[PDB]
Amino acid sequence: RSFDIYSRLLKERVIFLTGQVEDHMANLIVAQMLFLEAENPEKDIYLYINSPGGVITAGMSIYDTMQFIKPDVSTICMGQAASMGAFLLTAGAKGKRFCLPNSRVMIHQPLGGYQGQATDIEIHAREILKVKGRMNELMALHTGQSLEQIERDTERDRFLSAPEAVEYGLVDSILTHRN
Amino acid sequence: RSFDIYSRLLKERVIFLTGQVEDHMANLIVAQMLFLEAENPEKDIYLYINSPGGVITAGMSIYDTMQFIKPDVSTICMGQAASMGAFLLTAGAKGKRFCLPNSRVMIHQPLGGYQGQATDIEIHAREILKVKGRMNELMALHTGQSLEQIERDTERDRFLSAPEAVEYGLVDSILTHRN
Amino acid sequence: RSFDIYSRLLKERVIFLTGQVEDHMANLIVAQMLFLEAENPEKDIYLYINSPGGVITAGMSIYDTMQFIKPDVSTICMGQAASMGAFLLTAGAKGKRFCLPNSRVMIHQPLGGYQGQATDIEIHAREILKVKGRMNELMALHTGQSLEQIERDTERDRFLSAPEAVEYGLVDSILTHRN
Amino acid sequence: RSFDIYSRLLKERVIFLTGQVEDHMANLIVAQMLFLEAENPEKDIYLYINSPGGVITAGMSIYDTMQFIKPDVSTICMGQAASMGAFLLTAGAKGKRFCLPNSRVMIHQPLGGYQGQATDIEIHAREILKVKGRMNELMALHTGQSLEQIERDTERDRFLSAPEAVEYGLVDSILTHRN
Amino acid sequence: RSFDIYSRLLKERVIFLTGQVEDHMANLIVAQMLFLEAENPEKDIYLYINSPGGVITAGMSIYDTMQFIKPDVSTICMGQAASMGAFLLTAGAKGKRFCLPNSRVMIHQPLGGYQGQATDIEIHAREILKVKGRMNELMALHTGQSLEQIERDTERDRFLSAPEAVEYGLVDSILTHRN
Amino acid sequence: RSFDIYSRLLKERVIFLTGQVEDHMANLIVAQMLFLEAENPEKDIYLYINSPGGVITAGMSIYDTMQFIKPDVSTICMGQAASMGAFLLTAGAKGKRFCLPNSRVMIHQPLGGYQGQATDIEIHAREILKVKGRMNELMALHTGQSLEQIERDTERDRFLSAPEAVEYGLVDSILTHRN
């Protein structure tokens, strides 16, 4: 009886990624993902996305589980998919990634901040550059775009309307009307 | 006079570097150095030091005014001299860098931190790393140790009583009783 | 009687720009300059700089006084001259601007933050791009660089050594040892 | 003497209007004007201005004191003059109002707000509106522009470089070099 | 007389690098630079570049020749500057390098080949790797970019319009109209 | 004298572009172009064109040189001017471009080819397209035709006789008898 709306939508194999991406909320998407694999490792899974990004590693826990699990993971971004939100979005299974008409996307680069000794600082700094780069490769690969474009387009906050994210390979098309 | 105690002591060409180093206290110190040099380009200046360290750039505005002014600068560490404060101490006029018997010096590497994009984390990371290099050099200089000995013994916090101070090159001799 | 040490240095036509730039410290530095010009409109004036930057409107209060008064204004950098700090250091009389041996300079672009309606947001962004524009020109003027190279060089935090400072044409030479 | 640099410059008939505008800082300038008028009501009083604006009644106490006293009050703008600061800068004796080269101006409309019953909200709403009407009238009068061009440009924040400020008739000329 | 047209422009110190870069034409270009330095070692030398590149050692005799002669070699690119062409284009005197409005640059890595025993092949794959490293370094120096950035960017042919060349740091600006 | 007919007609400031456009013939044209401006930058230059086209870059080195030297460059098609011959023709000084009575002009898009890996084929196709656009823009720009109109007209070879050329905006008029 729509006792719990989301639990109910989990029976249509739909999952919601909303807001701040961080460990726990991420973990709750993983746990859903896995649960759906088992309930049926053959049917498609739905990941709706309206988020501004967040802690990356947490963000990556979702990503790897989207690949790891048997079923294809379709993604539909509504409202906004930014930074890490844009990533998991374009990480949907090819041909199954969407954008509602006025949703909007944003890309940019790994953000961070360490504090301590010079020695330690080079350590964590070298690390963020590696991640900055991997994230760029994994993005080059899901978008079909060169490492040059990503690198340039992601050095600074960059926005895309629904048409443009399609035109960029980020999502495959625009769902305008449930026909 | 005893109207203002730090003033009278100044007439003897004696300056105090107390507590943390930061732009303003450093500045007051730099003016006293400029002023005293203009009181007598040839008369040896005395600077006691009881500091736990502080802002590099700020300390470094003291050091450069130190190696710049016509006069010689004798430094007397007391209580303690740490980080930047160890630097300036072992940076006094060769042959006029002391320590009281129970004061203690402590050296180490530079501290720091930055928040922002990977790209900027980098700019700011290369810098402190450079800033680190120059620091080990001057230390290498004014002390006698090789760069290497310095580079190696500064990674971590290192304590030194006045004896070891001397045995290191930081201070030349150990005051005990005046005569 | 060498009461306020800064008064004493002021009688020596010497002026100190320490710390964050803001209307009041700036108002104080500007008043010092006028008074000095009044004392003797022909003699040089010395401006020591060790600032991390600050407010542009307040820094420009200084910039325009420097250029306004008859007395040439020699600038010397100890510790650091960053952002508006560096802009003022280079804003000195050509030929009389210096960098202590281990001071370090830093340049970048205008920073801002506004909150409001799209319409007002545009009046302000537009405005800061002009300020960013007029800024980069003044910088190209004082350093002998092309406007082209200035902007392209200030988009992100750029650090400069004293050697690089002089080489960039940001300061004519490095004050070394008294003479 | 120089034990107080602003008292000294005051003796040369210079008054500094710096920072936020408000009763006490305003009342000090009002007092310095009545003072300067007393030492001689013939020589021009010079009021520098580096303000972001502030309280309207507090600005109006300076405005009125200015027109009242006999000495022509000449205004010079440094850094910036926004809102009430733009208004005071222009209420300066015609022929004697200046902007330094890179000082930027800013006009807009009155800010305010009430809280309580409707009858009171109306009473104060009416009052701020009557205050707005006299302000544009005065601005019109002093800058010599149509009360409509003024009613118009003050609706939203509006920036003026030093030259446009001359074109607009806000100031009379630009001060560049002492000659 | 306009008997030989290039022999004529050579008197205006203009030198053309056209087509395939290979030992003999390269040697002709070097000889003109040496000859120009003999005539007047103070005056600049303009090198017009229109080339798809060519042999590395052939080009390096020009590179070093450029850096060795007293005159600053100013480089102007027309048509295109690819591979060894983009390289010599950027090795021109800092501040004096340009791209006609519609010239285009391409950068990439060394190309080569060997036939032989496994032991000979290893000496050669090692070597082309050392050449690879010096070019990236020399490219890093000359463009101002960082090593890894240059490496990362050259792995595959990269096109760059003149504006992108100016941004990237290969050339200093775009020549459009003689004035 | 008529020892070298081409050199002799160079004195009447005449230049011929005969045959396929390739780097070398292009260079000889650019150099004669620079040479003439150098002899007198005010008098017009006459570039006769009878070519079928050629290497785009080779052509552009010529284009940019035409727009760059001060001398105005009058273009005169004889026989025929297609592809890059068409482009350089309609690229001469507005008002000073012609067409002998029975000249024939042909226009169309870029030709090209590449062999290699999917990745590298992408980069090169991406490039001949950036070029096409730019080439079109420039055609629009010089014939005042709609940008879209040129895109259309240049999808497939389109022959234009002299009148049609004049009309299409490629050349201004037609020369039939030397009056």
Curated annotation (Swiss-Prot), chains A, B, C, D, E, F:
Domain of life where this protein originates: Bacteria
Gene Ontology CC, one term: endopeptidase Clp complex
Keywords linked to the UniProt accession: Cytoplasm, Hydrolase, Protease, Serine protease, Zymogen
Active-site residue list: 83, 108
GO molecular function, one term: serine-type endopeptidase activity
CDD domains, per the entry: S14_ClpP_2 (cd07017)
Recorded catalytic activity of this chain's protein: Hydrolysis of proteins to small peptides in the presence of ATP and magnesium. alpha-casein is the usual test substrate. In the absence of ATP, only oligopeptides shorter than five residues are hydrolyzed (such as succinyl-Leu-Tyr-|-NHMec, and Leu-Tyr-Leu-|-Tyr-Trp, in which cleavage of the -Tyr-|-Leu- and -Tyr-|-Trp bonds also occurs)
Biological process (GO), any one: protein quality control for misfolded or incompletely synthesized proteins
Family matches, as Pfam families: CLP_protease
Major subcellular location class: cytoplasm
Compartments where found: Cytoplasm
EC number, as in UniProt: 3.4.21.92
Protein role: Cleaves peptides in various proteins in a process that requires ATP hydrolysis. Has a chymotrypsin-like activity. Plays a major role in the degradation of misfolded proteins.
Sequence similarity: Belongs to the peptidase S14 family.
Subunit structure and binding partners: Fourteen ClpP subunits assemble into 2 heptameric rings which stack back to back to give a disk-like structure with a central cavity, resembling the structure of eukaryotic proteasomes. Component of the ClpAP and ClpXP complexes.
The protein's name: ATP-dependent Clp protease proteolytic subunit
Originating organism: Escherichia coli O157:H7
Phylogenetic placement of the source organism: Bacteria, Pseudomonadati, Pseudomonadota, Gammaproteobacteria, Enterobacterales
